[PDB]
Short mmCIF file of C-alpha atoms (C1' of nucleotides) and ligand atoms in Angstrom, two decimals:
data_model
loop_
_atom_site.label_atom_id
_atom_site.label_comp_id
_atom_site.label_asym_id
_atom_site.label_seq_id
_atom_site.Cartn_x
_atom_site.Cartn_y
_atom_site.Cartn_z
CA UNK A 1 159.61 98.96 61.49
CA UNK A 2 158.24 100.59 58.05
CA UNK A 3 154.87 102.61 57.81
CA UNK A 4 152.50 99.02 58.26
CA UNK A 5 154.43 98.36 61.66
CA UNK A 6 153.52 101.96 62.55
CA UNK A 7 150.55 102.28 61.54
CA UNK A 8 149.34 98.89 63.87
CA UNK A 9 151.60 99.89 66.81
CA UNK A 10 149.31 103.57 66.12
CA UNK A 11 145.72 101.80 65.93
CA UNK A 12 146.73 99.31 68.99
CA UNK A 13 148.02 102.42 71.02
CA UNK A 14 144.89 105.00 70.47
CA UNK A 15 142.50 101.93 71.27
CA UNK A 16 144.35 101.74 74.89
CA UNK A 17 146.04 105.09 75.93
CA UNK A 18 144.17 108.03 74.10
CA UNK A 19 142.28 109.61 77.64
CA UNK A 20 144.75 108.65 79.64
CA UNK A 21 145.77 111.36 81.78
CA UNK A 22 150.21 110.99 81.71
CA UNK A 23 151.00 110.47 86.10
CA UNK A 24 154.81 110.75 85.61
CA UNK A 25 157.68 110.01 82.81
CA UNK A 26 160.71 108.21 84.10
CA UNK A 27 164.13 107.52 81.43
CA UNK A 28 166.92 105.65 82.11
CA UNK A 29 168.05 107.03 78.36
CA UNK A 30 167.49 110.89 78.37
CA UNK A 31 169.49 111.03 75.69
CA UNK A 32 166.57 109.85 73.54
CA UNK A 33 164.64 112.52 73.71
CA UNK A 34 165.83 114.90 71.13
CA UNK A 35 164.04 117.92 71.98
CA UNK A 36 165.48 117.57 75.63
CA UNK A 37 164.05 115.30 78.72
CA UNK A 38 163.38 117.84 81.26
CA UNK A 39 161.13 119.14 79.22
CA UNK A 40 159.19 116.84 78.16
CA UNK A 41 159.22 115.57 81.94
CA UNK A 42 158.27 119.14 82.96
CA UNK A 43 155.47 119.82 80.40
CA UNK A 44 154.33 116.40 79.44
CA UNK A 45 152.91 115.37 82.91
CA UNK A 46 149.44 116.22 84.08
CA UNK A 47 148.46 116.38 80.75
CA UNK A 48 145.71 113.67 78.93
CA UNK A 49 146.92 111.90 75.44
CA UNK A 50 144.05 113.05 73.22
CA UNK A 51 145.19 111.44 69.93
CA UNK A 52 147.98 109.48 68.19
CA UNK A 53 148.28 110.39 64.27
CA UNK A 54 151.06 109.07 62.09
CA UNK A 55 153.24 110.37 59.31
CA UNK A 56 155.39 108.26 57.18
CA UNK A 57 157.04 106.11 59.97
CA UNK A 58 157.04 109.15 62.35
CA UNK A 59 154.12 108.74 65.70
CA UNK A 60 152.42 111.61 67.03
CA UNK A 61 151.30 111.87 70.11
CA UNK A 62 148.63 114.13 70.78
CA UNK A 63 149.28 115.22 74.40
CA UNK A 64 146.86 118.35 75.61
CA UNK A 65 145.63 120.98 72.78
CA UNK A 66 149.06 122.42 72.60
CA UNK A 67 151.26 119.17 72.47
CA UNK A 68 152.90 116.71 69.82
CA UNK A 69 155.20 113.73 70.27
CA UNK A 70 156.29 112.82 68.04
CA UNK A 71 158.21 109.31 68.28
CA UNK A 72 160.08 107.46 65.73
CA UNK A 73 160.61 103.82 65.85
CA UNK A 74 163.70 103.31 63.68
CA UNK A 75 165.16 100.17 63.13
CA UNK A 76 164.26 97.82 66.42
CA UNK A 77 162.35 100.40 68.34
CA UNK A 78 159.59 99.02 70.93
CA UNK A 79 156.50 100.00 72.77
CA UNK A 80 154.63 97.74 75.37
CA UNK A 81 151.81 98.24 77.43
CA UNK A 82 152.33 96.94 80.87
CA UNK A 83 151.04 96.74 84.87
CA UNK A 84 153.04 99.45 86.86
CA UNK A 85 154.65 96.86 88.81
CA UNK A 86 156.88 95.39 85.81
CA UNK A 87 160.15 94.89 86.11
CA UNK A 88 162.50 96.92 83.98
CA UNK A 89 164.11 94.82 81.11
CA UNK A 90 167.36 95.75 79.74
CA UNK A 91 167.05 97.84 76.48
CA UNK A 92 164.06 100.09 78.33
CA UNK A 93 164.53 103.43 77.91
CA UNK A 94 161.60 105.58 78.88
CA UNK A 95 158.06 104.71 80.41
CA UNK A 96 155.52 106.89 80.87
CA UNK A 97 152.69 106.35 83.77
CA UNK A 98 149.35 106.14 83.55
CA UNK A 99 147.21 105.82 86.79
CA UNK A 100 146.42 101.98 85.52
CA UNK A 101 149.59 100.91 84.18
CA UNK A 102 152.90 102.36 82.32
CA UNK A 103 154.05 102.81 78.34
CA UNK A 104 157.16 101.40 78.15
CA UNK A 105 160.21 102.24 74.99
CA UNK A 106 162.93 100.56 74.24
CA UNK A 107 164.70 99.94 71.37
CA UNK A 108 168.00 97.63 71.76
CA UNK A 109 170.31 100.18 69.02
CA UNK A 110 168.93 103.06 71.12
CA UNK A 111 168.21 104.67 67.54
CA UNK A 112 164.31 105.33 68.50
CA UNK A 113 163.91 109.07 69.05
CA UNK A 114 160.80 111.60 70.87
CA UNK A 115 160.55 114.74 70.63
CA UNK A 116 158.33 117.25 72.12
CA UNK A 117 156.64 120.24 69.55
CA UNK A 118 153.71 122.49 69.24
CA UNK A 119 150.69 121.81 67.46
CA UNK A 120 150.77 124.62 65.14
CA UNK A 121 155.09 123.46 64.60
CA UNK A 122 154.33 119.59 63.54
CA UNK A 123 153.51 120.74 59.96
CA UNK A 124 156.63 122.78 59.52
CA UNK A 125 158.43 120.55 61.37
CA UNK A 126 157.62 117.55 57.82
CA UNK A 127 158.33 119.51 55.36
CA UNK A 128 161.47 120.48 57.53
CA UNK A 129 161.86 116.51 56.48
CA UNK A 130 160.44 116.88 52.98
CA UNK A 131 158.21 113.63 53.87
CA UNK A 132 157.22 112.71 50.62
CA UNK A 133 152.40 112.16 50.26
CA UNK A 134 151.51 108.87 51.89
CA UNK A 135 150.94 105.86 50.58
CA UNK A 136 147.01 106.13 49.33
CA UNK A 137 145.26 107.11 45.87
CA UNK A 138 144.01 110.41 47.89
CA UNK A 139 147.63 111.87 48.48
CA UNK A 140 150.15 109.91 46.22
CA UNK A 141 149.84 112.08 43.22
CA UNK A 142 151.00 110.21 40.02
CA UNK A 143 152.02 113.14 38.50
CA UNK A 144 153.93 114.53 40.68
CA UNK A 145 155.44 111.13 40.88
CA UNK A 146 156.51 111.22 37.43
CA UNK A 147 157.72 114.62 37.49
CA UNK A 148 160.08 113.80 40.20
CA UNK A 149 161.71 110.70 38.47
CA UNK A 150 162.06 111.78 35.28
CA UNK A 151 164.26 115.21 36.85
CA UNK A 152 166.78 112.98 38.79
CA UNK A 153 169.08 109.94 37.92
CA UNK A 154 169.06 108.43 41.42
CA UNK A 155 168.65 104.49 41.21
CA UNK A 156 165.05 103.89 42.51
CA UNK A 157 165.65 102.67 45.51
CA UNK A 158 167.39 104.33 47.20
CA UNK A 159 164.71 107.15 45.65
CA UNK A 160 161.99 105.50 47.40
CA UNK A 161 164.28 104.69 50.66
CA UNK A 162 164.38 108.67 50.81
CA UNK A 163 160.86 109.58 51.97
CA UNK A 164 160.41 112.31 49.61
CA UNK A 165 158.48 110.63 46.66
CA UNK A 166 156.00 109.12 49.54
CA UNK A 167 156.50 108.14 52.70
CA UNK A 168 156.50 105.04 54.34
CA UNK A 169 159.20 102.87 52.26
CA UNK A 170 161.74 100.84 54.16
CA UNK A 171 163.69 98.11 52.84
CA UNK A 172 161.21 95.34 53.35
CA UNK A 173 158.45 96.76 51.95
CA UNK A 174 161.02 98.61 48.54
CA UNK A 175 162.19 95.08 47.27
CA UNK A 176 158.72 93.84 47.22
CA UNK A 177 156.61 96.99 45.76
CA UNK A 178 159.92 96.50 43.00
CA UNK A 179 158.72 93.01 42.83
CA UNK A 180 155.50 93.82 41.82
CA UNK A 181 155.89 96.32 39.37
CA UNK A 182 159.25 94.20 38.11
CA UNK A 183 161.57 97.01 38.60
CA UNK A 184 165.07 96.58 38.92
CA UNK A 185 166.55 98.56 42.55
CA UNK A 186 169.31 100.09 40.57
CA UNK A 187 167.47 101.84 37.70
CA UNK A 188 167.99 105.23 37.30
CA UNK A 189 164.85 107.15 37.86
CA UNK A 190 164.21 108.88 34.66
CA UNK A 191 165.58 105.80 32.31
CA UNK A 192 161.44 104.72 33.67
CA UNK A 193 159.13 104.84 30.91
CA UNK A 194 155.23 106.21 31.93
CA UNK A 195 153.92 102.59 31.98
CA UNK A 196 156.31 101.42 34.54
CA UNK A 197 156.12 104.59 36.58
CA UNK A 198 152.04 103.93 37.15
CA UNK A 199 152.20 100.26 38.23
CA UNK A 200 154.97 101.48 40.15
CA UNK A 201 152.37 104.08 41.78
CA UNK A 202 149.59 101.49 41.89
CA UNK A 203 152.06 98.59 43.57
CA UNK A 204 153.71 101.35 46.59
CA UNK A 205 149.68 101.53 47.37
CA UNK A 206 148.54 98.17 47.31
CA UNK A 207 151.72 96.35 48.96
CA UNK A 208 151.23 98.85 51.98
CA UNK A 209 147.45 98.77 52.61
CA UNK A 210 147.54 95.71 52.03
CA UNK A 211 150.25 95.11 54.87
CA UNK A 212 148.74 97.32 57.19
CA UNK A 213 145.38 95.14 56.85
CA UNK A 214 147.86 92.59 57.65
CA UNK A 215 149.59 93.33 60.99
CA UNK A 216 152.28 94.26 59.33
CA UNK A 217 155.42 91.95 59.07
CA UNK A 218 156.27 90.02 62.36
CA UNK A 219 154.61 93.98 72.58
CA UNK A 220 151.79 95.68 70.25
CA UNK A 221 152.17 95.82 66.41
CA UNK A 222 153.84 91.61 66.93
CA UNK A 223 150.94 90.13 66.27
CA UNK A 224 151.18 90.99 61.79
CA UNK A 225 150.49 88.26 59.21
CA UNK A 226 152.57 89.96 55.91
CA UNK A 227 155.20 88.87 56.99
CA UNK A 228 153.96 85.38 54.94
CA UNK A 229 152.92 87.37 52.20
CA UNK A 230 156.33 88.85 51.55
CA UNK A 231 158.06 87.48 47.95
CA UNK A 232 161.27 87.89 47.87
CA UNK A 233 162.76 90.60 51.20
CA UNK A 234 164.57 88.10 53.50
CA UNK A 235 164.40 85.38 50.66
CA UNK A 236 167.40 84.68 48.65
CA UNK A 237 167.95 81.87 46.96
CA UNK A 238 163.92 80.78 47.01
CA UNK A 239 162.19 80.86 44.00
CA UNK A 240 160.34 83.41 42.60
CA UNK A 241 158.00 81.15 40.58
CA UNK A 242 159.18 82.07 37.51
CA UNK A 243 160.06 78.30 35.53
CA UNK A 244 163.09 78.09 38.49
CA UNK A 245 164.57 81.50 38.98
CA UNK A 246 165.69 82.24 42.59
CA UNK A 247 165.90 85.53 44.21
CA UNK A 248 169.42 87.03 44.33
CA UNK A 249 170.84 89.16 47.12
CA UNK A 250 173.05 92.30 46.13
CA UNK A 251 174.06 96.07 48.46
CA UNK A 252 172.33 98.35 46.69
CA UNK A 253 173.73 102.12 48.70
CA UNK A 254 174.78 99.63 51.54
CA UNK A 255 171.50 98.12 52.17
CA UNK A 256 170.99 94.52 51.13
CA UNK A 257 168.22 93.88 48.84
CA UNK A 258 166.61 91.56 47.29
CA UNK A 259 165.63 90.63 43.52
CA UNK A 260 164.71 88.79 40.79
CA UNK A 261 166.86 89.61 38.55
CA UNK A 262 165.28 87.30 35.57
CA UNK A 263 161.88 89.94 36.15
CA UNK A 264 163.90 93.01 36.44
CA UNK A 265 166.42 93.69 34.34
CA UNK A 266 166.59 97.94 33.32
"C1'" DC B 1 190.11 86.54 67.14
"C1'" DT B 2 187.73 89.92 63.47
"C1'" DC B 3 184.32 91.56 60.12
"C1'" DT B 4 179.45 91.69 58.45
"C1'" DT B 5 173.98 91.92 59.18
"C1'" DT B 6 169.57 93.99 61.00
"C1'" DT B 7 166.07 104.19 60.02
"C1'" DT B 8 167.56 108.79 59.77
"C1'" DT B 9 171.92 111.78 59.90
"C1'" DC B 10 175.69 112.70 58.27
"C1'" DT B 11 180.17 113.26 56.17
"C1'" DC B 12 183.55 112.61 52.01
"C1'" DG B 13 185.56 113.19 48.21
"C1'" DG C 1 175.02 119.79 45.01
"C1'" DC C 2 175.84 114.57 43.88
"C1'" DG C 3 175.99 109.48 46.27
"C1'" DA C 4 177.79 105.99 48.64
"C1'" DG C 5 177.40 103.50 52.74
"C1'" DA C 6 179.74 104.60 57.78
"C1'" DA C 7 178.08 106.32 62.35
"C1'" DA C 8 174.27 106.73 66.34
"C1'" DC C 9 174.10 100.95 68.68
"C1'" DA C 10 173.88 96.81 70.18
"C1'" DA C 11 173.43 91.36 69.03
"C1'" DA C 12 173.87 87.60 65.92
"C1'" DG C 13 176.69 85.41 63.21
"C1'" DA C 14 179.68 83.73 60.54
O1 LIG D 301 155.35 79.10 37.08
C1 LIG D 301 155.85 80.11 36.00
N1 LIG D 301 157.11 80.15 35.16
C2 LIG D 301 156.98 81.14 34.64
S1 LIG D 301 158.89 81.02 33.52
N2 LIG D 301 156.28 82.57 34.45
C3 LIG D 301 155.60 82.60 34.91
N3 LIG D 301 154.35 83.16 35.79
C4 LIG D 301 153.58 82.43 36.20
N4 LIG D 301 153.68 81.65 36.64
C5 LIG D 301 154.95 80.87 36.07
#
DNA sequence: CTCTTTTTTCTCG
DNA sequence: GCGAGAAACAAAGA
């Protein structure tokens, strides 16, 4: 999941589980609770979910006044709301049981994580990760963006994927953003001119906000419609609608990369 | 059979 | 520090 999918999930969870008391917490895979499963179980049980927030691709459960549960879904994490008599499925790892249902976390690849953090430790937590600003006109300052790009010789695609320039892009939407802004994914950032940087900046906010509005690209968060709007990602060999040009796939710093070479030259 | 594909952290050199 | 890319892991596919 990338930011739009994670934001979709956050909204669905906000509608359903906020206000509910955690009756118990059970795990078949406690290793994904990085801060310690017994501790999390002991602290959160009996507490009421007060809210759900998000920061980049991180979910933040506000549980009680003093605790935050930071969940990351990584590559394949999925939440679903189920009745209490629901059977366990093969890649279900964690369950948060309420009086009238349960929240189950599943993850085929077991990459996803849970971290129990104090409320006053949430900002330090994200500072330590050097998470960049949220992809909004209010938070995503073009000038800071411009300066970070000029001071770096990194390739633009892997630099955007680092979460430090701006939070929330993953492989899908970075490919889409660079196509939209007509920038080659291997372009060194200190080579970008001001006008490209401006378009890139606006593109990042436009693509992500549109994907959020369409419910993301597609068990919560599975009814998204952004996958019909994708111009390049996963469309290797198809047309760019540029006079017969086709989408190429390459590897960039180990990641599959879809782009239109005709439109995205260095 | 083998190897490659599909977020963040970590290791290498 | 760098930057690339394998590994945490599973499953599918070539
Ligand atoms: O069909 C098109 N062909 C080309 S070469 N460029 C375009 N820009 C928008 N549509 C087109």
